[PDB]
């Protein structure tokens, strides 16, 4: 009953004053972006244009210190509009 309210409160309190123009750790650290690919399908290859099509899930991960939070659960699936 209360979670869908306390998490909107948390998230609104999580990105107020948050600036997305800046890297996480802009002033102190290099940002290590862990990356991964799942190839859903490969091809077709084109000999005449010398190209090939590939369809993938492209996955990235990094740590943004601004967004660490405390709450009843340890992982939030957010709407991609965020």
């Amino acid at each position: 009953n209360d979670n869908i309210t306390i998490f909107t409160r948390i998230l609104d309190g999580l990105l107020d004053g948050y600036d997305n123009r800046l890297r996480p750790g802009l002033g102190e650290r290099i940002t290590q972006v862990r990356t991964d690919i799942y190839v859903t399908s490969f091809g077709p290859v084109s000999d005449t244009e010398m190209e090939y099509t590939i369809d993938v899930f492209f996955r990235q991960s990094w740590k943004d210190e601004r967004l660490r939070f405390k709450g009843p659960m340890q992982r939030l699936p957010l709407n991609n509009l965020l």
Binding site: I4, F7, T8, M73
Partner: protein, 109 residues
Amino acid sequence: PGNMSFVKETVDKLLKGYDIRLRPDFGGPPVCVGMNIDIASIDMVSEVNMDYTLTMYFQQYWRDKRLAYSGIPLNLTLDNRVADQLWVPDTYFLNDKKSFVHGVTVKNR
């Protein structure tokens, strides 16, 4: 007072504070998205491309306890532009190569 202003204020009260960034019953049990399809046509099938073109009316159906309203017996139908103000499932077609929602006059939603 009156239906027009009454309905306007009811919808505003529904959407006031509605967080699109959280799914229905967030944190609780999963939301069940029932869906059904009416096929307009399969337009063409191509061996050289190993694909086919499908046109369909695609529909989805779920509860959002936040959008429950009282005092109005009607099934409210709203302009499609409300779709950008509501949470909707992230449904997608895995083997889709290329697709689009029809947009003549106004986007077909």
